Each structure stands twice: as C-alpha cells, then as structure tokens.
Specification:
Elements lengths: L2 E5 L6 H8 L19 E3 L10 H6 L6 H10 L3 H5 L18 H15 L3 E5 L7 H15 L6 E5 L11 E6 L2 E6 L1 H7 L5
Parallel strand pairs: 1-4, 1-5, 2-3, 3-4
Antiparallel strand pairs: 5-6
C-alpha cells in the first residue's frame, strides 16, 4: 500500500531498476522475499502492443465485463481515443493495423494494468507521453486507482518532480544505486528534492 517514487537522471538505471524489480536481472548475491517465493502487471519503459483489438488489448486473458470496461475507459482517459478510433473497440490494433501513438500505446498499457487488478503495479514514466491535461487525468484517476486499489502496493517510477509531493514517500536512486530514501525533510537535508 505504500506510494513510492523512483527517480534519477536519464540513463541512471531507473528502467534497469524496474527490470530488477521485475526479476529480469541476475542476482549476484543476497536474499530477496516479496511474499512470492513462498511454496502482477507491467508497463514497460517502451510500450508495446499485441496484435489484437483494443478490447482484447484491455482484457489480457480475462473474461469480458462491461461495467469494469466502462470504469476503465473513463479512468484510463480512453474516451478521446475511442472518439478518434474508426470502429471504437473493434479497431484492429498492433502490427499491420491502426498505428497508435506512443501516448495512446501508453494509455492502452495503463488500461491493461488497471484492468488486470494486480497487487503490484510498475509504472515506467507513465505520463511522459501524455499531455498536461491527460497527466492531470492520470493524477486524479491515478489517485483513484491507488484509492481504487484495495490496499495494494503501487510503485511509480518517474523522471518528473511534478507529483513527488503528491505521492506518499520517495526513494531516490542514482548511478544504479539507491542514494537515499526518506521524508521530504530528509530529502531537504539531502538538498535534492528542493532542487
């Protein structure tokens, strides 16, 4: 249930840190238990599309629910996209289909993650490819997504400082290492968060 930001310079390893969070690197040593080693949704740094309908890009091996779909459509800012799609959800997307923008692909990925209702969400800079108004949408609906999240843990990697006061706690990373984790006052003493 914590709201935790991950920040640092372009190329400092933030996306690689997310890959570490996905278990996609080689652990040289140490112990890691996330309750999943007892005997998940993903928004990748570069969005990718499956070759299917927008609808099936949303379902992601699930049954179809259309109230959940209505709430997801409103919550994921997908009404302008539907409004500009030639057949709405029946538009063929992915390879050899309609060419979605990077922002539309990101919004589809966000909708995929919200629809999957996972316990852990990894967002790799999710509002970079969206406009300021859509970023405000992702702010309010994000806050009512984590709020919609019934106690779930949400990890929001971002390169932007715009909403670091508006998440709960920040962990600052640099050069592939964690530099500091802590309160606003702690990071004021770091003399970083103000900068």
């Amino acid at each position: 249930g914590q709201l935790t930001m991950i920040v640092g310079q372009v190329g400092c390893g933030k996306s690689s840190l997310l890959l570490a969070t996905l278990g996609e690197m080689q652990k040289v040593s140490g112990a890691v238990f996330w309750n999943s080693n007892l005997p998940v949704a993903y928004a990748s740094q570069k969005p990718w599309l499956l070759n299917a309908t927008v609808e099936e890009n949303i379902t992601f091996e699930s049954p179809f629910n259309k109230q959940r779909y209505k709430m997801v459509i409103e919550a994921c800012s997908l009404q302008p996209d539907i409004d500009i799609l030639p057949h709405g959800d029946q538009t063929q997307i992915g390879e050899r289909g309609i060419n979605l923008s990077g922002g539309q692909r990101q919004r589809i990925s966000v909708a995929r993650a919200l629809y999957q209702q996972t316990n852990v969400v990894f967002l790799d800079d999710p509002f970079s490819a969206l406009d300021v108004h859509l970023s405000d949408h992702l702010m309010q609906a994000g806050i009512l997504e984590l709020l919609r999240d019934d106690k779930r843990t949400v990890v929001l990697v971002t390169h932007k400082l715009q909403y670091l006061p508006h998440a709960d706690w920040i962990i600052a990373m640099k050069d592939g290492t964690i530099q500091r984790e802590g309160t606003l006052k702690d990071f004021q003493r770091s003399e970083c968060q103000l900068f």
